[PDB]
Every structure is written in structure tokens, then in C-alpha cells.
């Protein structure tokens, strides 16, 4: 795999979103990976519905948090609608898939990256955007403005995001806190420290969709 990856340069990443006060990061994270794999497999970049996963993933807890893996399983079992068909409202509502017509896209499964393994995560990122988790509660992460972030942070993961690239000293992360946070909505997080948790626990729990 190469020394630099940046799926934005391959046209596989949509604009940065803002989840608002709702604890829906798990759905935003999942959607980034769906947008990426559909572009990689079909050549078209589309936006898909975080709100649909928020409403319809019965294993997750709406705005009280949730699981990227179960959101991705929902897209593999059923499918997902375009964002315009099912736009983001920032509050959990009833699942309205069955009233919004046929699904726009469908995947074929979900895989987990071997946890606590930097090279395994880089290998997956070289192939597609990946859903990852990290500890975002610390003020240093909250106030990040730019540069390669080293912390301070612990490993008590609480926030799902998406890895869309990497370089020799960092992993490139699309956050869901709007374009005014970080590097136009992104953070580069230090890698190569030898801590098996990853900086801010970045290697704890990583999943990606499979699409034939």
C-alpha cells in the first residue's frame, strides 16, 4: 500500500456534515463508508441518508448513540435511500423507509478490521473509507484547529468517525462537526506511536461495508 492515501482526491468523499446536538455520529460514520464504496464500485458519488439509519437501526439508540456495525448491517440486509429523499433532521423519528420508495443503494455485507492493529487499519483504508471510533470528549480534541493531532487524549472511545486517508505520520479523519471544526471538518491524527490502542483509542473498533 502507498505512503499517502486521500479518498477525497479520488472523488469518493462528499461534503462535511454537521450532526448537531444529536448523538448520531455512528450513522454519519456509516454513511461516509457507504458513499465511498459506491463511488469505488460504480463510479458515482452520491449522498446517502444518515436520518434513515438513525430512525431505522433497531439495535442503536437514536440520538443516544449507536453502532456503526449495525447501521452497516442494515444497509446490507435492506438498503439505503439518498440523502435528499430522507434528509437529516437531528432527532430520531419513526422509520419511514417503506414510504419513501425503493432503496437507492444496497451493500453485500460488513467486515471488521482486526482491532488494535495499525497496519491492518491502514490496509483497509488503502482499499476504501473505514468507520473508526475514538475518544472525542477531551477538550484538546474538541478545540482542535489543525496540524497532526497527538492528544492529550485517553482511549475511552465515545465518537464514531470515518478514516478517509493516511500519510507517513497520520490517519486522515472526516468528522461530523461541520466545516468550521478542525481542517475544514477533518483531523489528521498521529500514527506510528507504538500504542496498540491508537492515539485517542483510534484502533478500538473499525468496520467497513462490502459491495460486490
From Swiss-Prot:
Family: Belongs to the peptidase C1 family.
Residues the record lists as binding E64: 25
Swiss-Prot/TrEMBL keywords: Allergen, Disulfide bond, Hydrolase, Protease, Signal, Thiol protease, Zymogen
Region of the whole protein represented: 134 to 345 of 345
Lineage, top ranks: Eukaryota, Viridiplantae, Streptophyta, Embryophyta, Tracheophyta
pH dependence: Optimum pH is 4.
EC number: 3.4.22.2
GO molecular function: cysteine-type peptidase activity; serpin family protein binding
Active site annotation, chain numbering: 25, 159, 175
Name of this chain's protein: Papain
Amino acid at each position: 500500500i502507498p505512503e499517502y492515501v486521500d479518498w477525497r482526491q479520488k472523488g469518493a468523499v462528499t461534503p462535511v456534515k454537521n450532526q448537531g446536538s444529536c448523538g448520531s455520529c455512528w450513522a454519519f460514520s456509516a454513511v461516509v463508508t457507504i458513499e465511498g464504496i459506491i463511488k469505488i464500485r460504480t463510479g458515482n458519488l452520491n449522498e446517502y441518508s444518515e436520518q434513515e439509519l438513525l430512525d431505522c437501526d433497531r439495535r442503536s439508540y437514536g440520538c443516544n448513540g449507536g453502532y456503526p456495525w449495525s447501521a452497516l448491517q442494515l444497509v446490507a440486509q435492506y438498503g439505503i435511500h439518498y440523502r435528499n429523499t430522507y434528509p437529516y433532521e437531528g432527532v430520531q423519528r419513526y422509520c419511514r423507509s417503506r414510504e419513501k420508495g425503493p432503496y437507492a443503494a444496497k451493500t453485500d455485507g460488513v467486515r471488521q478490521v482486526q482491532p488494535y492493529n495499525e497496519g491492518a487499519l491502514l490496509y483497509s483504508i488503502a482499499n476504501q473509507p473505514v468507520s473508526v471510533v475514538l475518544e472525542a470528549a477531551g477538550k484538546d480534541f474538541q478545540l482542535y484547529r489543525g496540524g497532526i493531532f497527538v492528544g492529550p487524549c485517553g482511549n475511552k472511545v465515545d465518537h464514531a468517525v470515518a478514516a478517509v486517508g493516511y500519510g507517513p505520520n497520520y490517519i486522515l479523519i472526516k468528522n461530523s462537526w461541520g466545516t468550521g471544526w478542525g481542517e475544514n471538518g477533518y483531523i489528521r491524527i498521529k500514527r506510528g506511536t507504538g500504542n496498540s490502542y491508537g492515539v485517542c483509542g483510534l484502533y478500538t473498533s473499525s468496520f467497513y461495508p462490502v459491495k460486490n
